[PDB]
Amino acid sequence: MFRQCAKRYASSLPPNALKPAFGPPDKVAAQKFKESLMATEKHAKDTSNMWVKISVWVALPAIALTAVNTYFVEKEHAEHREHLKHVPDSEWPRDYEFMNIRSKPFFWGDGDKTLFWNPVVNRHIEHDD
Amino acid sequence: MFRQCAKRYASSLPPNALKPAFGPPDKVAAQKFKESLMATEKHAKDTSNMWVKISVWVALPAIALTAVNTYFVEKEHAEHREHLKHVPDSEWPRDYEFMNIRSKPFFWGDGDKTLFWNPVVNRHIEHDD
């Protein structure tokens, strides 16, 4: 019976459960910017895989130097002598066999046919196995 | 006279969709920049400069071993001093012929006489067949 004790000018019905807002905001560029991003996909490809992959890149030209440095380290020792002496000729395994054909180059020599009886034994005549 | 009214219909609705409006050049370039200056400042990054910057970081450790290698080879003659007599003869092109001409200056030398029997091959030619 008693409702609204004031005379209105136009029929209306303000909000009660929902607020339609009676004032258009100002910040509208913040939406069109974030909205364009959503659909527009920029993230792609694996950047982490390519990043670490660079390691091997510089690791190739780098080791190339360190690799040669090693040989240079023992270069001083190599030139030096400690074991494996090289003086006599008998030590040479090739010599013996080479001595055979050596009979031609020199041609002249002492005891060629007689000395030949030595190597001929190394040949060893086989029959079957 | 006049009879222009603003609100006549008792049922209005905000235009959901609008119509296109073409015309003269709008130029979105000058606006793209003016928009950034509006609130935010100019700003200027330089992450790319980090690529060359790191170059020095890795250039320190690398050159470290490189520098040490410089003295390493120098230690060669250092440790093994006293070297009046040469060695490489076939390597150095000059050496070979040099040993021949040196036969005079030296005058007296042991081992050069017999060895001289080899270089002579170059002096005289050999015609076979």
Curated annotation (Swiss-Prot), chains A, B:
Gene3D superfamilies: Cytochrome c oxidase, subunit VIa. InterPro entries: Cyt_c_oxidase_su6a, Cyt_c_oxidase_su6a_CS, Cyt_c_oxidase_su6a_sf. It is found in: Mitochondrion inner membrane. It comes from Saccharomyces cerevisiae (strain ATCC 204508 / S288c). The keyword Hydrolase does not apply. Residues 10-43 are mitochondrial matrix. The gene is COX13. Belongs to the cytochrome c oxidase subunit 6A family. Pathway: Energy metabolism; oxidative phosphorylation. It is a single-pass membrane protein. One of its GO terms (cellular component) is mitochondrial inner membrane. PROSITE patterns: COX6A. One of its GO terms (biological process) is proton transmembrane transport. Residues 72-129 are mitochondrial intermembrane. This is Cytochrome c oxidase subunit 13, mitochondrial.
